[PDB]
């Protein structure tokens, strides 16, 4: 029987795949055993946060399936995610429904 490092760690992203991608990315001649575990774990965390917010936005929109619009809403409404993705354009995301106050009627 073979049991994987992700299974021993209780995580969802594959330790083996992240490890291989680090080994083949021409980044360093050696890679420690804990580095791909840490990296994979951070990726789960960030994915869970983004999917959490996108799901919330979908439910607010009475949608059961997340669409790119919901991803854009999630990234732009969250202050820290918008900072992290400040120079990132999501396709079919649109923009936030933001109107300047001075442009509203009197």
């Amino acid at each position: 029987k073979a049991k994987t490092r992700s299974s021993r760690a209780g995580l969802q992203f594959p330790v083996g795949r992240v490890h291989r991608l680090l080994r083949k990315g021409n980044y360093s001649e050696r890679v420690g055993a804990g580095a791909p575990v840490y990296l994979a774990a951070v990726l789960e965390y960030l994915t869970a946060e983004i999917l959490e917010l996108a799901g919330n936005a979908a439910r607010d929109n009475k949608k059961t399936r997340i669409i790119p619009r919901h991803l854009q809403l999630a990234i732009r409404n969250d202050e820290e995610l918008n900072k992290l993705l400040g120079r990132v354009t999501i396709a079919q995301g649109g923009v936030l429904p933001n109107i300047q106050a001075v442009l509203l009627p009197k």
Partner: protein
């Protein structure tokens, strides 16, 4: 007959197109422009469908963002109408001009 006040339909269109996600630039003229510019870079180029869609998504996002910044600069000057000088200021401050 009936006539809408200046400003209501503009705002309605803004809300309409900011709520939805369909592309606003026509496919065929965009492709034609891209191909025209390309002849002067390399001859008889072929372009993938997803490549033209990529250029169009990038172009529309860039122009929408530039128009957002232009609008912010115009409103800053206690104006509503965008001017060429507004575009030039936005691009200069962004650092590409």
């Amino acid at each position: 007959p009936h006539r809408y006040r200046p400003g209501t339909v503009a705002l309605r269109e803004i809300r309409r197109y900011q709520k939805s996600t369909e592309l606003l630039i026509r496919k065929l003229p965009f492709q034609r422009l891209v191909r025209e510019i390309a002849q002067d870079f390399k001859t008889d180029l072929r372009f993938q469908s997803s490549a033209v869609m990529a250029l169009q998504e990038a172009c529309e996002a860039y122009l929408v963002g530039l128009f957002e910044d232009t609008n912010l600069c115009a409103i800053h000057a206690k104006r509503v109408t965008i001017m060429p000088k507004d575009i030039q200021l936005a691009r200069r401050i962004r650092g590409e001009r």
